[PDB]
């Protein structure tokens, strides 16, 4: 409802260089919409959001072996703020 719909944080170099102006991005569960998540990111931290996307995101990866490869699907959501430059301390990271 508010704390639901999640997956894993983001740490790239581009997802950070843009976070300096107010561009956050938090992955979500393999199943989620855009209307339900919209009210799960604003009521989770405490700030209005405008943009937000979510879609299947697979990623075949492995090492050695004849046991194929698994396809992990983890949707990703990239929210955005209008005037809010920071929320708590995750922006000053």
């Amino acid at each position: 409802s508010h704390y639901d719909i999640l997956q894993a944080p983001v740490i790239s170099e581009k997802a950070y260089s843009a976070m300096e102006r107010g561009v956050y991005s938090f992955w979500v569960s393999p199943k989620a919409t855009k209307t339900e998540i919209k009210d799960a990111i604003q009521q989770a931290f405490g700030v209005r959001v405008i943009g937000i996307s979510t879609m299947n995101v697979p990623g075949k990866r492995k090492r050695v072996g004849r046991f194929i490869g698994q396809r992990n699907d983890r949707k990703k959501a990239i929210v955005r703020l209008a005037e809010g430059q920071s929320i708590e301390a995750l922006a000053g990271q």
Binding site: S1, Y3, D4, L6, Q7, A8, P9, I11
Partner: protein, 66 residues
């Protein structure tokens, strides 16, 4: 966790614990992909406590309704 000093709660504060561990574990994942998580047991025990809630209230729907 299981004693009678837990199932005595009504359907207002007892349900508050349900969304208390789910949100807590949410702030534990961000430390798993950042190298700040040093308590692997903070997830095992946590999820184990979450099940010790939805199972209790579920019993109050058969013992008091038949």
């Amino acid at each position: 966790m299981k004693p009678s000093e837990m199932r005595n709660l009504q359907a207002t504060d007892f349900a508050k614990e349900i969304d208390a561990r789910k949100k807590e574990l949410m702030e534990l994942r961000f430390q798993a992909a950042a190298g700040q998580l040093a308590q692997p047991h903070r997830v095992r025990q946590l999820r184990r406590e979450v099940a010790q809630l939805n199972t209790v209230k579920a019993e109050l729907a058969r013992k008091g309704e038949q």
